Design an enzyme around this catalytic site. Structure first.
Site, PDB file in Angstrom:
ATOM      1  N   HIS A  82       1.581  12.721 -33.212  1.00  0.00           N
ATOM      2  CA  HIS A  82       0.466  11.968 -33.771  1.00  0.00           C
ATOM      3  C   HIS A  82      -0.523  11.504 -32.689  1.00  0.00           C
ATOM      4  CE1 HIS A  82      -1.499  10.016 -37.054  1.00  0.00           C
ATOM      5  NE2 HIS A  82      -1.443   8.834 -36.468  1.00  0.00           N
ATOM      6  N   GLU A 120       5.471   6.141 -30.497  1.00  0.00           N
ATOM      7  CA  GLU A 120       5.816   7.519 -30.800  1.00  0.00           C
ATOM      8  C   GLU A 120       6.785   8.078 -29.751  1.00  0.00           C
ATOM      9  OE1 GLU A 120       2.613  10.308 -31.497  1.00  0.00           O
ATOM     10  OE2 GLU A 120       4.017  11.606 -32.569  1.00  0.00           O
ATOM     11  N   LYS A 171      -5.351  15.360 -30.895  1.00  0.00           N
ATOM     12  CA  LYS A 171      -6.423  14.367 -30.999  1.00  0.00           C
ATOM     13  C   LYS A 171      -7.131  14.149 -29.672  1.00  0.00           C
ATOM     14  CE  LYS A 171      -4.480  11.669 -34.879  1.00  0.00           C
ATOM     15  NZ  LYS A 171      -3.332  12.608 -35.004  1.00  0.00           N
ATOM     16  N   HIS A 183      -9.532  11.726 -34.157  1.00  0.00           N
ATOM     17  CA  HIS A 183      -8.794  11.219 -35.284  1.00  0.00           C
ATOM     18  C   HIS A 183      -9.664  11.332 -36.535  1.00  0.00           C
ATOM     19  CE1 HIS A 183      -5.853   9.174 -37.433  1.00  0.00           C
ATOM     20  NE2 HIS A 183      -5.644   8.120 -36.667  1.00  0.00           N
ATOM     21  N   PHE A 201      -1.309   3.506 -40.370  1.00  0.00           N
ATOM     22  CA  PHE A 201      -1.412   2.122 -40.836  1.00  0.00           C
ATOM     23  C   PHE A 201      -0.676   1.878 -42.138  1.00  0.00           C
ATOM     24  CE2 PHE A 201      -5.020   3.519 -38.498  1.00  0.00           C
ATOM     25  CZ  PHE A 201      -5.028   2.600 -37.456  1.00  0.00           C
TER      26      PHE A 201
HETATM   27  C1  LIG Z   1       3.355   3.836 -37.952  1.00  0.00           C
HETATM   28  C2  LIG Z   1       2.155   3.829 -37.422  1.00  0.00           C
HETATM   29  C3  LIG Z   1       1.099   2.797 -37.510  1.00  0.00           C
HETATM   30  C4  LIG Z   1       1.387   1.635 -38.421  1.00  0.00           C
HETATM   31  C5  LIG Z   1      -0.028   2.784 -36.736  1.00  0.00           C
HETATM   32  C6  LIG Z   1      -0.522   3.881 -35.802  1.00  0.00           C
HETATM   33  C7  LIG Z   1       0.380   4.264 -34.617  1.00  0.00           C
HETATM   34  S1  LIG Z   1      -0.792   5.430 -36.831  1.00  0.00           S
HETATM   35  C8  LIG Z   1      -2.566   5.532 -36.464  1.00  0.00           C
HETATM   36  O1  LIG Z   1      -3.255   6.445 -36.864  1.00  0.00           O
HETATM   37  C9  LIG Z   1      -2.926   4.399 -35.607  1.00  0.00           C
HETATM   38  C10 LIG Z   1      -4.283   4.119 -35.139  1.00  0.00           C
HETATM   39  C11 LIG Z   1      -4.553   2.951 -34.240  1.00  0.00           C
HETATM   40  O2  LIG Z   1      -5.234   4.765 -35.586  1.00  0.00           O
HETATM   41  C12 LIG Z   1      -1.894   3.581 -35.208  1.00  0.00           C
HETATM   42  O3  LIG Z   1      -1.989   2.599 -34.286  1.00  0.00           O
HETATM   43  K   LIG Z   2       0.732  15.656 -35.182  1.00  0.00           K
END
Ligand SMILES: C=C/C(C)=C\[C@@]1(C)SC(=O)C(C(C)=O)=C1O
Ligand SMILES: [K+]
Ligand SMILES: C=C/C(C)=C\[C@@]1(C)SC(=O)C(C(C)=O)=C1O
Ligand SMILES: [Cl-]
Ligand SMILES: [Cl-]
Ligand SMILES: [K+]
Lengths: 414, 414
Positions: free
Chosen positions: B309, B320, B338, B343, B402
């Site tokens: 991610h 992660e 990314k 994103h 999120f």
């Molecule tokens: C389980 C993951 C959660 C709640 C948050 C993350 C890591 S996902 C994401 O796309 C993102 C941001 C800041 O865009 C996060 O900070």
């Molecule tokens: K990925």
């Protein structure tokens, strides 16, 4: 081929329910209201009906507004649907005896029709008045349409998935369907599931009215919603949200919870017909009912009761009647709860799923209100006049939405 | 216990892919761009950056705007996400050789992060200027967040379910997960799945900036996105949408389609930790990876490649890294796309799922851009400098959003 009846899928039971409606904040009082032929629909008193000269002047607001139960902190950290979810979440867990479940076997699946739509207008107005720094660091978390599910998962400690399916009017039934998969596939043992929807506002009324989808029978508000009646003229808005606790039978036994009903299968299909109108032939919608029966391990001859989508539009009730014949369930006792509670878009599949469970537990179907002249072309056994007490062994809850989304849920008497 | 490896689930293959990105409208050109170390991220030229004095001044718009491909009719009957879905839908079906499938075995599952949010501001402004009758009879069907999936199902004739999961940033991966269930449970043989998201606007920038989630490294736009780098300072927006065609192996053989890859399992869990921050310990996120492996029939020692991610936030990349150790996959070759593409919230899980499939087909991982100083506390084998050609047999695509929503997808080389 796995089924519930042959042991291919584990047995899943409904162990708690909760809802807020235009009749009552309490589901048991709502159920008693239904059985006494109360309607939730009245003249809208809202100043915006005269402001805009709306064609539609009726609907049912919650008996007990959500924000009666909300302090200043809630009122600025959550959208309305999140507030409604927190309230209903909290109520459901108490009713279930406040159990301690394993977080890692616990899922949440909650649908809505639209989401936190008020909070984007607000956030746009704050940035216009005073710049980018007047947007809340909290804004994202109110605005996101998984928002109400997020809040429930966080409030109750669900770590085996927090999902939000959106399929307009069938959202809250689809949520319960996916919660049932989440469990029979091994991902969870316990799930909170259902649907929440915002209050009656002026824009949705404008949008649905312009489709000719809505009743304008304003002089008799309780008589406007007429599903399957020869004289129906569209639907009526009635606010709601509902959640149910589901879990494997073995899990419920181990914690001493007494089940209200079993949830046996779910079928999801689609029309690929039209963006808003249902397919007239009702074939794909009937096939969703069939799919639930296959997965349950039932035959159509086992279906005693159908809780219909019955919105009270002309083409909607006509299509559903065809769907039910197509599924081979047209000998069933039919109830259309939207006759008393109105249409609540994303929530309404969920509330009607709760009604289906209470029908099975209590062996009674409330009367469909305003059903006074059977439509020649429908030909269904619609319950009317007074509650019908009967030996109801299995039932199907139907839920269809704009987009041609069909969901059917098969429930059994425990 | 059913698995893909033991024959409990049928074999599912990826037979076509399509995407539009900040590098290219064509997925194969995008892939070649990635392999040559192109970035999609540049200075935002948009007049609204100077209008609002935004902290953030970089991001990647589509190389080829969607509305270049849209006439006046499209422009007034659909939201942007629906237009993007129609375009991508139409492209994917051509790439697949325009096959004739059985509508009743055909599903569509497409996620978005937000939906047709522009169209509610519009519909509100029309009712303010000129009353309730200036709202489109069409409005509901643009506005509904299942809207892009509805349009694809209607355009392609999908009658075995049209679903829309919303889980912020993991929406497009979750869609592919549910499409995979829809098929291994018997409901479908063929599915179109992925994710679409709107363009870079000023409000989302304001909302994510106020969280400190975003890079403000404006003097070097291509160097801003630094996943796992000691010097990362948040994410960068990069527009995208992506779809893939999946179907059973037996279905693909029967129609002569050559598979790009197999899709072997999917795991969905949740954090129940915080509304926007990921859980630091990365346990539940690691468990989603494990769940995909269980369902695939794989061991962590089989995982050659992780498509991370990697948003490039400090706490995100830290969480992660822990997730991957937790899953036992930390010996794997890691890519964070990314770093080059940015994103794209609801779409991005889907586009990265497409990249994972191309990595498997071609035995190469593009370089993670800007990875110049390994973070002490991360300790991962991040591909960098130039593409790494390698024997990649199985891979995991991670997607978190999120709300603490975790999705992992296990893919195999065909
Ligand atoms: C389980 C993951 C959660 C709640 C948050 C993350 C890591 S996902 C994401 O796309 C993102 C941001 C800041 O865009 C996060 O900070
Ligand atoms: K990925
Ligand atoms: C498959 C069903 C479709 C597309 C439409 C229905 C019948 S559902 C619904 O809730 C509704 C109305 C008018 O509200 C419909 O007219
Ligand atoms: Cl706070
Ligand atoms: Cl038109
Ligand atoms: K129903």
């Amino acid at each position: 081929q796995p089924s519930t009846a042959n042991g291919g899928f584990p047995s899943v039971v409904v162990t708690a329910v909760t809802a807020t409606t235009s009749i009552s904040p309490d589901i048991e009082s709502t159920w008693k209201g239904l059985l006494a032929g109360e309607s939730g629909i009245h003249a809208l008193e809202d100043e915006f009906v005269t402001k805009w000269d709306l064609a539609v002047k009726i609907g049912g607001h919650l008996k007990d507004p959500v924000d009666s139960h909300m302090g200043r902190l809630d009122m600025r950290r959550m959208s309305y649907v999140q507030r409604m979810g927190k309230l209903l979440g909290g109520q459901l867990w108490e009713s279930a005896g406040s159990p301690e479940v394993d977080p890692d076997r616990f899922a949440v699946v909650v649908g809505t029709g639209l989401g936190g739509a008020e909070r984007i207008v607000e956030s746009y107005d704050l940035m216009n008045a005073g710049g980018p720094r007047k947007v809340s660091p909290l804004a994202v978390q109110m605005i996101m349409p998984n928002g109400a599910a997020a809040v429930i998962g966080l409030q109750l400690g669900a770590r085996a998935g927090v999902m939000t399916p959106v399929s307009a009017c069938s959202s809250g039934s689809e949520a319960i369907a996916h919660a049932w998969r989440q469990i029979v596939m091994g991902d969870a043992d316990v799930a909170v599931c259902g649907g929440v929807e915002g209050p009656i506002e002026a824009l949705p009324i404008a949008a649905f009215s312009m489709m000719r989808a809505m009743s304008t029978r304003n002089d008799e508000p309780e008589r406007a919603s007429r599903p399957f009646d020869k004289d129906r003229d569209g639907f009526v808005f009635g606010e709601a949200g509902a959640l149910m606790l589901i879990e494997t039978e073995e899990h419920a036994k181990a914690r001493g919870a007494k089940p209200l009903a079993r949830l046996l299968g779910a079928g999801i299909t689609s029309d690929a017909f039209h963006m808003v109108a249902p397919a007239a032939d009702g074939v794909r919608a009937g096939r969703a009912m069939t799919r639930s029966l296959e997965l349950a391990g039932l035959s159509p001859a086992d279906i005693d009761h159908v809780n219909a989508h019955g919105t009270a539009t002309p083409i909607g009730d006509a299509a559903e009647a065809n769907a039910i014949r197509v599924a081979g369930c047209d000998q069933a006792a039919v109830y259309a709860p939207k006759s008393a509670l109105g249409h609540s878009i994303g929530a309404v599949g969920a509330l009607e799923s709760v009604l289906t469970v209470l029908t099975l537990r209590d062996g009674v179907i409330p009367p469909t209100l305003n059903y006074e002249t059977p439509d020649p072309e429908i030909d269904l056994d619609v319950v009317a006049g007074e509650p019908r007490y009967g030996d109801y062994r299995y039932a199907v809850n139907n839920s269809f939405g704009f987009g041609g989304h069909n969901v059917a849920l098969a429930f059994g008497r425990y």
